[PDB]
């Protein structure tokens, strides 16, 4: 993090207490939990310098996820630089050709920046910072989606002893965290409620005097009329 | 069937040979096979009188499907009569109120028609005949879809000894003959190819150097690179 | 949360630290514990924008409870809008017909609000905010009461090894969290103390020289004269 | 099928009796038998409209072979359209640029053709029809060769109880329906007769006072001098 003061942009590091809490969050909840992504968005609020994001991912991520994240961050930054050479009005670019932003300046590899966060904060633009930050966030999302797969939705059955809300949670999780289009999730969730969800609940849904046309309505109906046991 | 000659509309019955062949087709292939529906469409080519369709369904259908079909035919004819009272320009209706078509005239129950196909062919309109015929076809479709369910798609697995084309046929049949929207069948078929289809073919599809984005392409790829055994 | 400043209503997000603590509270204590409802009331203190409440319930609730909560919130907001069209003096409404509040404006679906919390905070009324907040709280209460049933009170027995205060806690919980009228809980709790609560305590309550006419008095008496073991 | 009459090209459907017989032929004999290909050539005699061929393949082929056939038909039609843009003298094309034939017109997807066979027969050219028909025939051949592989020729042995004419039939089938060049089939068939075909017939062929230089001559010799049993 940088503070743009009168003397110039002064760099302030992130608290190691927040970083330790975020690292333990990633350690217990995993990379893909919505609470973890919310915490990352929180610590991704102010535009960070390449040094900050690099050290942050070095600390919170293990070695192999860190390698994957470096790869993904490079790819996303390259897409950004292609869009930048496709539009001279990038908030990282300038009007003349002398302000064109090279990947050495984005990854912090340019002259006067390697290993020095103060000089980094000096030469970098705010548009550069926000582009780097958005790129790093998208790369984190990619790596998180890659490190742990969503479980195959079509293999999910309600166990003989499992409750129905746990089964519904697991199924909705695996269906929404999958490769289906957004407009195909609700019908699939409904038809999986009807064919999975062991034959007692199957018959309970089948003999519904009303027509249930939404996963929430099916869940409410089943929770009302379920066999207390 | 009727022939509209100079003396007047003369009724000609359908051949009992064609009816016997159609009955045996329904007996061996079932009610829902595409060949059976094609044969029914064939014998549903000329506009039939209520007597013809009623006797045809009496002969080709069993007792319980015949009861179901009578119910469905009545419901569809009632929808037709509601649309007819909602539009005085029905090809079964006339311009004045004296030509309004009652359900007794559609079901063949009106005066001068009960049990007599000749009088039926005399008083009926061609628009009446085509409306009755379309109603009977839709009712047959409903009863055929009702008598035998499509198998639940989410419970289909490729057996240890089953070939892949049989599994693909069964899966595509159960997915297309189900309650899914038309725009959700291809993604579901693909994701069921990937998660069902026992782990040898699962790994064969997983390690595809190209991206397969269509059930036909997946089928072609698997048929090319399958383990001959 | 919004701050109504001189430039205009500026939106401030809730702390992810408080949200993480509340999510872990819901994870360990459940949805129905009085501590959880107190914490929700705490984080429901300032009038929240639809964006805030929606994201809050997305984070703290699982997928299936979140679907149930969306349903219940919609129903409660519809009741609010019916009361609003039944009274033109709603703090969300205005005096003329041009200020009537549609459900698109309450759920945050209206024009200039979809996905943008700043514009949301701009166009929304404080009465709108408090109505949305009360609706969301009532919906949370409904879903919490629905997700986990109170245990059937008439099936509660004091175990052979269970202490009496645990049995009394369980019984009072199940009786007060049930479908009985408020004026029928004390007599039922007393008569369940007398007939459940294995025969040693049954005889201890039976041979009470004084008449015990309150669950608290029965609990005090039994705790005084109980067989220390 | 279309009849080009004085009023204009009138469409006549194929008989459902012939289609049912062809479907049962495909069901019993398979896709690759020479009798099946002859029957398809028979029903592929008059130039068919895209509607006719599409419905024909929908009826005679299962779901997965139908998907494969749609793919192959599209590819072959694309090759045809490439040849058409490579030669302005295509019987489907015209002399000016306004008669160039797009794939929407070949697949029946163009304007005034979607779902309507009468309009289809109206706007289509006879060269268009014959090109579509030849493309569909080649696609059927590809899919038939793909759905069922020829058995590996180099793994064919004459069983201990199998007769010699059955072994010769199986071997010639697998060798001619394989990936060998046409000029390499006879020597391979001969050398497989000599090394397979269990040692009694091996010695019978070895001790041939004449030199046998053709599979037919070897078959005749073995049938003459075989051990009757």
Author numbering:
A (entry chain A), B (entry chain A), C (entry chain A), D (entry chain A): 1 to 229
Paper passage:
High concentrations of NaPO4 are known to induce RSV CA to assemble predominantly into T = 1 icosahedral CLPs, which consist of only 12 pentamers. The observation that within pleomorphic polyhedrons the CA pentamer constitutes the rigid building block prompted us to investigate if the pentamers within T = 1 icosahedrons and polyhedrons are structurally identical. Hence, we acquired cryo-EM micrographs of T = 1 icosahedral CLPs and subjected them to single-particle analysis, yielding a 3.1 Å resolution reconstruction. At this resolution refinement of RSV CA into the EM density was unambiguously possible. We compared the model of T = 1 pentamers with the model of the pentamer derived from the polyhedrons. In fact, the two models are virtually superimposable, showing an RMSD of their C-alpha atoms of 0.74 Å. This finding further underscores the observations that the RSV CA pentamer (1) is very rigid due to the tighter packing of the CA domains in the pentamer, (2) always promotes the same local geometry, and (3) is independent in arrangement of the size and shape of the CLP. In contrast, the increased flexibility of the RSV hexamer allows a more random distribution of pentamers in mature RSV cores. This enables RSV CA to even form inter-pentameric contacts, which can be regularly observed on polyhedrons and in particular T = 1 icosahedral particles.
As the virus buds from the cell, the viral protease cleaves Gag into several fragments, including the capsid protein (CA) that then assembles into the mature capsid shell (core), rendering the virus particle infectious. The CA portion of all retroviral Gag proteins folds into two separate domains, the N-terminal domain (CANTD) and C-terminal domain (CACTD). In mature lattices, CANTD interactions form only intra-hexamer and intra-pentamer interfaces, while CACTD interactions are also involved in formation of inter-hexamer and inter-pentamer interfaces. Our results show that, like lentiviruses, RSV is sensitive to IP6 in vitro and in cells, where in the mature CA lattice IP6 binds in a pore formed in the center of the CANTD hexamer.
